Amino acid sequence: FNESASIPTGLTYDDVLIIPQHSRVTSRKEVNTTTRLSRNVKLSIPIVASNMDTVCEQRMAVAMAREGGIGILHRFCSIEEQCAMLREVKRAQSFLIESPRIILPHETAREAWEGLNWKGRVGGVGCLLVVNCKNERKLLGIITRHDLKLADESTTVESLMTPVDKMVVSTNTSISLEEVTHLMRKGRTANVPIVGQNGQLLYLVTLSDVVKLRKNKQASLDSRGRLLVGAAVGVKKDDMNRAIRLVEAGADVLVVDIAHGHSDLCINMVKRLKGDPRTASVDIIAGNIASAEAAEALIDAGADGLKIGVGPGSIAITRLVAGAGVPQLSAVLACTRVARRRGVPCIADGGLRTSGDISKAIGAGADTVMLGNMLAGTDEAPGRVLVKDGQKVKIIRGMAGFGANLSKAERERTSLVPEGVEGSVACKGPVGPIVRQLVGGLRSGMSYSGAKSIEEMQRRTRFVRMTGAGLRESGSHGVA
Amino acid sequence: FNESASIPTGLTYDDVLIIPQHSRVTSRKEVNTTTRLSRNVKLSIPIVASNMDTVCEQRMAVAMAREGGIGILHRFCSIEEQCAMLREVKRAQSFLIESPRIILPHETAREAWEGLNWKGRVGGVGCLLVVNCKNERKLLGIITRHDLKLADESTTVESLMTPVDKMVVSTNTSISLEEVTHLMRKGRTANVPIVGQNGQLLYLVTLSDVVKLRKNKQASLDSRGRLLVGAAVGVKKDDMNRAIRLVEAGADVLVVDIAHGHSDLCINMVKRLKGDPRTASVDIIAGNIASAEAAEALIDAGADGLKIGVGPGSIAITRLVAGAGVPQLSAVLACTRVARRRGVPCIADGGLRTSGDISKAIGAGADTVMLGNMLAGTDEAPGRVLVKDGQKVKIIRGMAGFGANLSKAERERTSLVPEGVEGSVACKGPVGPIVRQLVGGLRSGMSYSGAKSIEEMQRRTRFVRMTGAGLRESGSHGVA
Amino acid sequence: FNESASIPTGLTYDDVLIIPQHSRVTSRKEVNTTTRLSRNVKLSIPIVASNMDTVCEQRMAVAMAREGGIGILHRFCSIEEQCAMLREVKRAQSFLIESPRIILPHETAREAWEGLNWKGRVGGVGCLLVVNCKNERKLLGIITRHDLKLADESTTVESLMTPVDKMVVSTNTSISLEEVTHLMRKGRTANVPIVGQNGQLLYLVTLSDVVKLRKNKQASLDSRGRLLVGAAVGVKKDDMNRAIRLVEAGADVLVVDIAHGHSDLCINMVKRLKGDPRTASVDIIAGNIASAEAAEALIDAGADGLKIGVGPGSIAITRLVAGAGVPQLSAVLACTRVARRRGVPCIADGGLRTSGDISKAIGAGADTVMLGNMLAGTDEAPGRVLVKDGQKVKIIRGMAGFGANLSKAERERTSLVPEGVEGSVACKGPVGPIVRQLVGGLRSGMSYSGAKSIEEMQRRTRFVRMTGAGLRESGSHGVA
Ligand SMILES: Nc1nc2c(ncn2[C@@H]2O[C@H](COP(=O)(O)O)[C@@H](O)[C@H]2O)c(=O)[nH]1
Ligand SMILES: Nc1nc2c(ncn2[C@@H]2O[C@H](COP(=O)(O)O)[C@@H](O)[C@H]2O)c(=O)[nH]1
Ligand SMILES: Nc1nc2c(ncn2[C@@H]2O[C@H](COP(=O)(O)O)[C@@H](O)[C@H]2O)c(=O)[nH]1
Ligand SMILES: Nc1nc2c(ncn2[C@@H]2O[C@H](COP(=O)(O)O)[C@@H](O)[C@H]2O)c(=O)[nH]1
Ligand SMILES: Nc1nc2c(ncn2[C@@H]2O[C@H](COP(=O)(O)O)[C@@H](O)[C@H]2O)c(=O)[nH]1
Ligand SMILES: Nc1nc2c(ncn2[C@@H]2O[C@H](COP(=O)(O)O)[C@@H](O)[C@H]2O)c(=O)[nH]1
Ligand SMILES: [K+]
Ligand SMILES: [K+]
Ligand SMILES: [K+]
């Protein structure tokens, strides 16, 4: 039976351990996890939230960027819906707030409360600038939640506002962080509007944003100090329109995402996106792939990053429906060998269950990991909490399954051989502490490889293969 | 321990994945699944229903041919019974209906209803031609279910019939599909009898059959426009008599089927079948085999197709009773290497659980797959629905087990070391949608291999081996 | 502890058995199950499908009426939606079809096919009458599915139609069933339009409807030969508008349905419905109640029928959330004692698990039973089939639970302490055979009471109480 002997063996994460190496690491603090998402996008931590409609919408994208990673907004929504989520992410924080929310002086406190609970930002906004009219936005004063706390619904805005002559106001549209910090410290105020030469409202700077920018600059930020966020598109004719509008909404990267990324459909979508100035202003990531030849083709088509993984996802059953796939450790090894020589970062997407798997993925050459299941069921993941026979749970479902595709039909106003499933995950709490523990686990693995950086982790890691017997010894055994 | 190291390793479907390849496939519609069952028999889809007495009798054979595959009628029945199932399959549809059912004009509506519910076709027939007597069949008119809907049981046929002078009748025994379509369109009628020069009834053409022939020519048809169907025989002296009578009944292929096909018993049965003009008019398929040497021997004996599989069947325990077998992927690889050079198609028989396994079998060189378990418990599978501790189930049982062999004794009017078992499967509904989903899964696997045809799938597919750890990552993991 | 001793004991179905009595019943056919739903509505069988959004929409209501029972359309939909379901039920069959579907002669076969698949009747319609224009409906001919079977999408209706001068047409707007049967038998036709003095189309009579009316008159029919159907309303101001529109749509009874029917809200809704001529034309049923005092109050308010049951429903948890309820056998006994003296039929609603429970409910005085769980998951029940960890299932959910109430918000375009739950039931197949088996079980229980009628069952039944030990002996014990 000679044909069988020539078939190569592919490995997944559970097939290997990282071999301990000489470590000069003395402090857990010396281990730097900064990495590249794509050719022109750096991240403080190598964690990407999956573009799944049970993992990443605006609340997850905001949380991931705040931890120093990023979320990819899923495309199983209308273009209008996807862009709206993106604008909400961009609205979470800023340095100079463009188009700050305003109100007119003859309006009521009831209308002030409605403006403060603006649906354009999760949590609303903390102040409204009082202006004479919508067209001129001549600044008359400012009103905050605090100023409304004892008001009757009928009380006028101007009766409760701080007038502009009592405000600290600037005309410096280039004001620095140090300068506005000085104005707030000296003026003992929490809001500095920026106005034009005719007193018209141009920007707002808030103490909340200044405090964040002065603190740990872990957060993933664009050039305006807003949170970084990506968005997924498909490969159909209409996806080009989606891509253009996502970039207009502020997308920092686009992710071309189809099950079989080694296809002309994906290669031609990448070429189209790099060929149009309306979309070529942002890095184009493409997947999903699992071979050296596929990496070469997508890189040659112009991809700024590659997403690796055919079948390993928790809710994925491509391997059961089509029979196709590559064990994920071998896929990462093969794809990153090609990509590293061309300078193209790779996302290891799918099949990760523990922080230990993240260490292995980075050790096998990945620059980032993409997580679905490990982040599903967190507070910030979309969906309702449900009681699944006793405990609190949330839905996780494949994007090639029935549930996600009927929901894509219900949201976009519209013969499926499914390649994903639906299930529940236990509610995990806020995603922040979970991400921090995963990064802490990665740092432990880097210390075992003697690595103080991601590039050192990729260069220094050596693996040893284990049998099923070795795998059992690796988890907890013999206790209850 | 050197002897052990020289034993080769055989692989089954769960040992490998199809490696994704460059795909130029743009539309799911561009993927053609047409294939060969045997040297002279083509099929639109590569699915064969197993010759098991819990899988394929007349209703399953009809359904499979209608989907573009085929069923193999099992031989655990009397010759008379096997031939009767075959004639019912052939009676399901036709272009020219030979010996159409008739009735005499002085008969009653009660007798008309009995003739319409003729046991020679599942569902009966829709019309009876009224003729003067059984010997001359001079056409007097036609009576349909519609004409009986308000009749009393005592009303005469001729009182309710449409008379012949009001019918559209032809004398063209070579009438084309376009010509009879024109006669039906112009005559605004649903039945065109074909009569001889003396008005005697020769054939009938019905609108139902014309509509089918005008629609999607997916269905597996013989030269008369009837559904294709095969039949199994053994290797005993009496099996030659069974074979002759099956061919007379309309069998389109014969399948010589014994557990150990690499035996003189099987080789000599193939030689006997090719040597007799009463059976050599149809392709002779033989199995079951699992080695290159076995393929060579059966091909040299004259086989037009090979059936591959020793032990992998869901209900099979040959490997537990005799200890013999070959892991099915390696068996397909080895057998098809020999057979492809001789032009002999191969059926991968047994051990298939998902559409993904079908993609692997075709990728390993098989031209068709044979399914037992995946089709058992469908509406069209034989047997009664049963309640197995709550839910609706149907029996599936091995043909070398006790249950099937006592039933073979009860049907043919008649020291077993069993090599099959009995069990239940959940009721699956109609087989049609299940077959369509399996073919859809296969098309997905072909797209991953970049293949637009079965021959391209066989040439282009490359496998990667996975460990048990890789297999776990391949299904659903970490969700409920 | 004397206070405790004075609390009476309530019984449920599992607490009692029907004591066998002297039976003169010789044939299973002698047992008549005809009963009253309400003062002025009779049913051939005593089975009512529950007004739950997982049990009864138009397909279930049609099936129940065809078996001789009735369905109550649920109100967790817009008024427009509830009325639309009702009109579809009324459209399922008729004697004189009002406003039969028409088409114009210059239209295409493609437009004919669209008219035949009219969404106003489940399954569409079988013919379209060809008329000169929508305003006059002068009959020009008729076109059927059969006439389109060989047409091109572009072929004109008038080219394919049967012209009116070749049709059998009547001007008798009072035509009897015997007379139209004669016209169809003599004319050898399946459609008899009824036209006016100027040839304008007034009604259509079809052979399908005639055959049904000639067969077993088991079906629950209104005076026009359409299927009987009821509809639920609440007790809010807007429910009066819903009630008026339901009656206009053809509702044969209205069911005032709230959890606590012994309340001024329910009593005043009944009084309002009986007091308005727009709703007083149909029987008003009210519930849910569980005491003699409650029956007296609703009867005094004018109820034509009572629905009995507080808490016993399969998906109901009123008893766990509020702590209130009455064991269902005792509730039926107490309520029917009052109602029988006033001539008001009672529906035993909830907690029924087997046909044996139905016999007990009727024996305890109920005129009908209402079933949710036993009919959920049938083909005709609403909702999608789902795979719940292996087998095919359908959702069943309480109308006071979260799932049904969010769906009521999604359908009507809109602080819940839930009193119902959600769950799955195994798919049961078509509801018809299930209903027939339940009625067969009831007939067996009636035979044990020596009863040949429902009234005899209510008068003759005697119960014996069993302990938990007796209950175990009653089901299957000691076998696998
Ligand atoms: N006041 C105000 N804050 C905004 C607006 N848009 C976004 N934000 C964000 O909302 C946060 C304000 O926090 P606060 O202290 O106002 O609750 C900051 O991160 C700020 O950038 C806006 O229009 N007005
Ligand atoms: N084959 C397949 N992969 C999916 C499907 N849905 C999500 N995925 C993949 O699974 C990844 C998540 O993997 P997880 O971290 O949950 O194991 C996603 O980022 C995506 O690449 C699906 O329906 N089919
Ligand atoms: N009328 C008629 N149909 C037959 C006979 N034998 C087989 N059939 C098949 O029964 C089907 C007729 O459908 P119908 O429209 O008659 O229900 C066709 O597929 C036809 O070929 C026969 O003897 N008479
Ligand atoms: N060894 C053995 N094979 C069987 C027996 N019965 C059926 N088979 C094989 O099992 C195949 C069905 O495999 P399945 O698709 O159910 O896994 C049949 O086509 C036949 O080759 C049996 O009793 N013993
Ligand atoms: N032809 C026709 N049938 C209707 C219409 N509305 C309801 N139906 C019902 O549809 C059924 C007709 O069955 P057919 O034989 O037309 O398939 C009958 O029960 C009939 O009452 C209509 O407008 N036209
Ligand atoms: N208390 C309560 N009863 C319900 C609820 N939903 C349905 N029901 C009752 O339960 C009955 C169905 O009972 P089943 O036949 O499923 O045991 C319905 O007809 C209705 O009276 C609910 O959410 N709460
Ligand atoms: K361990
Ligand atoms: K998987
Ligand atoms: K018993």
Short mmCIF file of all heavy atoms in Angstrom, two decimals, chain C residues 197-220, unseen atoms left out:
data_model
loop_
_atom_site.label_atom_id
_atom_site.label_comp_id
_atom_site.label_asym_id
_atom_site.label_seq_id
_atom_site.Cartn_x
_atom_site.Cartn_y
_atom_site.Cartn_z
N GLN C 197 -76.91 37.54 -14.82
CA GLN C 197 -77.75 37.66 -16.00
C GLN C 197 -76.99 38.24 -17.18
O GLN C 197 -77.34 37.97 -18.34
CB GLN C 197 -78.99 38.50 -15.69
CG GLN C 197 -78.88 39.30 -14.39
N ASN C 198 -75.92 39.00 -16.92
CA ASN C 198 -75.09 39.59 -17.97
C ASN C 198 -73.76 38.84 -18.15
O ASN C 198 -72.76 39.44 -18.55
CB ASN C 198 -74.83 41.07 -17.66
N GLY C 199 -73.74 37.54 -17.84
CA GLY C 199 -72.54 36.73 -18.03
C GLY C 199 -71.41 37.00 -17.07
O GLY C 199 -70.31 36.46 -17.26
N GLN C 200 -71.62 37.81 -16.03
CA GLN C 200 -70.55 38.19 -15.12
C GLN C 200 -70.31 37.09 -14.08
O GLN C 200 -71.24 36.44 -13.61
CB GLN C 200 -70.89 39.52 -14.43
CG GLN C 200 -72.03 39.45 -13.42
CD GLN C 200 -73.41 39.64 -14.04
OE1 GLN C 200 -73.72 39.11 -15.12
NE2 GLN C 200 -74.27 40.38 -13.35
N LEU C 201 -69.05 36.89 -13.74
CA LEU C 201 -68.68 35.80 -12.84
C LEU C 201 -69.12 36.12 -11.41
O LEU C 201 -68.74 37.16 -10.86
CB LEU C 201 -67.18 35.58 -12.89
CG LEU C 201 -66.60 34.53 -11.94
CD1 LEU C 201 -67.14 33.15 -12.28
CD2 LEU C 201 -65.09 34.57 -12.04
N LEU C 202 -69.91 35.23 -10.80
CA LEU C 202 -70.37 35.41 -9.43
C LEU C 202 -69.73 34.43 -8.45
O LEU C 202 -69.18 34.86 -7.42
CB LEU C 202 -71.90 35.28 -9.35
CG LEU C 202 -72.70 36.24 -10.23
CD1 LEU C 202 -74.18 35.92 -10.11
CD2 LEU C 202 -72.41 37.68 -9.83
N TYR C 203 -69.78 33.13 -8.74
CA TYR C 203 -69.17 32.12 -7.88
C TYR C 203 -68.48 31.08 -8.76
O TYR C 203 -68.63 31.06 -9.98
CB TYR C 203 -70.19 31.41 -6.98
CG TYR C 203 -71.04 32.32 -6.13
CD1 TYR C 203 -72.33 32.65 -6.52
CD2 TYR C 203 -70.55 32.86 -4.94
CE1 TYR C 203 -73.11 33.49 -5.75
CE2 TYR C 203 -71.33 33.71 -4.17
CZ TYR C 203 -72.61 34.02 -4.58
OH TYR C 203 -73.41 34.86 -3.84
N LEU C 204 -67.77 30.17 -8.10
CA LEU C 204 -67.23 28.97 -8.73
C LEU C 204 -67.51 27.78 -7.83
O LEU C 204 -67.35 27.87 -6.61
CB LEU C 204 -65.73 29.11 -8.99
CG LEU C 204 -65.03 27.83 -9.46
CD1 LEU C 204 -65.51 27.49 -10.89
CD2 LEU C 204 -63.51 27.99 -9.39
N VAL C 205 -67.94 26.67 -8.43
CA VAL C 205 -68.04 25.39 -7.73
C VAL C 205 -67.07 24.42 -8.39
O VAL C 205 -67.07 24.28 -9.61
CB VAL C 205 -69.48 24.84 -7.75
CG1 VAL C 205 -69.59 23.65 -6.79
CG2 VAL C 205 -70.48 25.93 -7.39
N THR C 206 -66.24 23.76 -7.57
CA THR C 206 -65.24 22.84 -8.07
C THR C 206 -65.55 21.41 -7.66
O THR C 206 -66.15 21.16 -6.61
CB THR C 206 -63.83 23.20 -7.57
OG1 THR C 206 -63.74 22.89 -6.18
CG2 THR C 206 -63.56 24.66 -7.75
N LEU C 207 -65.11 20.48 -8.50
CA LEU C 207 -65.29 19.06 -8.21
C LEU C 207 -64.63 18.68 -6.89
O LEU C 207 -65.18 17.86 -6.14
CB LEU C 207 -64.73 18.23 -9.36
CG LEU C 207 -64.60 16.73 -9.20
CD1 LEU C 207 -65.97 16.10 -8.98
CD2 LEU C 207 -63.92 16.13 -10.42
N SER C 208 -63.46 19.26 -6.60
CA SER C 208 -62.77 18.94 -5.35
C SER C 208 -63.66 19.21 -4.15
O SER C 208 -63.72 18.40 -3.22
CB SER C 208 -61.48 19.77 -5.23
OG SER C 208 -60.56 19.46 -6.25
N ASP C 209 -64.35 20.35 -4.15
CA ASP C 209 -65.23 20.70 -3.05
C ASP C 209 -66.45 19.80 -3.02
O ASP C 209 -66.91 19.40 -1.94
CB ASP C 209 -65.65 22.16 -3.17
CG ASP C 209 -64.54 23.12 -2.83
OD1 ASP C 209 -63.77 22.84 -1.89
OD2 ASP C 209 -64.44 24.18 -3.49
N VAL C 210 -67.00 19.48 -4.19
CA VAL C 210 -68.17 18.61 -4.25
C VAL C 210 -67.84 17.23 -3.71
O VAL C 210 -68.60 16.65 -2.92
CB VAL C 210 -68.70 18.53 -5.70
CG1 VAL C 210 -69.73 17.41 -5.84
CG2 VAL C 210 -69.30 19.87 -6.12
N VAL C 211 -66.69 16.68 -4.11
CA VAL C 211 -66.28 15.37 -3.61
C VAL C 211 -66.18 15.38 -2.09
O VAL C 211 -66.67 14.47 -1.42
CB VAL C 211 -64.96 14.94 -4.27
CG1 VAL C 211 -64.29 13.81 -3.48
CG2 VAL C 211 -65.21 14.51 -5.70
N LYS C 212 -65.56 16.42 -1.53
CA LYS C 212 -65.44 16.51 -0.08
C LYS C 212 -66.81 16.54 0.60
O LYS C 212 -67.03 15.86 1.61
CB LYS C 212 -64.64 17.75 0.31
CG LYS C 212 -63.14 17.65 0.06
CD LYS C 212 -62.45 18.96 0.42
CE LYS C 212 -60.95 18.91 0.12
NZ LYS C 212 -60.45 20.28 -0.24
N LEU C 213 -67.74 17.35 0.06
CA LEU C 213 -69.06 17.47 0.67
C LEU C 213 -69.87 16.19 0.53
O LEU C 213 -70.75 15.92 1.36
CB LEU C 213 -69.80 18.65 0.06
CG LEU C 213 -69.18 19.98 0.46
CD1 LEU C 213 -69.59 21.10 -0.48
CD2 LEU C 213 -69.56 20.31 1.90
N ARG C 214 -69.60 15.40 -0.50
CA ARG C 214 -70.29 14.13 -0.66
C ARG C 214 -69.72 13.04 0.23
O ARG C 214 -70.42 12.05 0.50
CB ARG C 214 -70.24 13.68 -2.12
CG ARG C 214 -71.17 14.48 -3.03
CD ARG C 214 -70.91 14.17 -4.50
NE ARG C 214 -70.66 12.75 -4.75
CZ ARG C 214 -71.60 11.87 -5.06
NH1 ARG C 214 -72.87 12.25 -5.17
NH2 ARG C 214 -71.28 10.60 -5.28
N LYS C 215 -68.48 13.18 0.70
CA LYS C 215 -67.82 12.13 1.45
C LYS C 215 -68.26 12.14 2.91
O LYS C 215 -69.40 12.52 3.22
CB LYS C 215 -66.29 12.27 1.35
N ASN C 216 -67.36 11.74 3.81
CA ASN C 216 -67.67 11.71 5.24
C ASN C 216 -67.84 13.13 5.75
O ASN C 216 -66.86 13.88 5.85
CB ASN C 216 -66.57 10.98 6.00
N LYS C 217 -69.08 13.51 6.07
CA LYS C 217 -69.34 14.83 6.64
C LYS C 217 -68.88 14.86 8.09
O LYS C 217 -69.63 15.27 8.99
CB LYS C 217 -70.82 15.19 6.53
N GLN C 218 -67.65 14.42 8.34
CA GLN C 218 -67.01 14.64 9.62
C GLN C 218 -66.57 16.09 9.79
O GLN C 218 -66.63 16.62 10.91
CB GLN C 218 -65.80 13.70 9.77
CG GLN C 218 -65.19 13.68 11.16
N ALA C 219 -66.15 16.74 8.70
CA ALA C 219 -65.47 18.04 8.82
C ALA C 219 -66.33 19.08 9.52
O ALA C 219 -67.56 19.10 9.36
CB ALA C 219 -65.07 18.55 7.44
N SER C 220 -65.68 19.95 10.30
CA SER C 220 -66.35 21.06 10.97
C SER C 220 -66.53 22.20 9.98
O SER C 220 -65.55 22.85 9.60
CB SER C 220 -65.55 21.52 12.18
OG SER C 220 -65.10 20.41 12.93
#
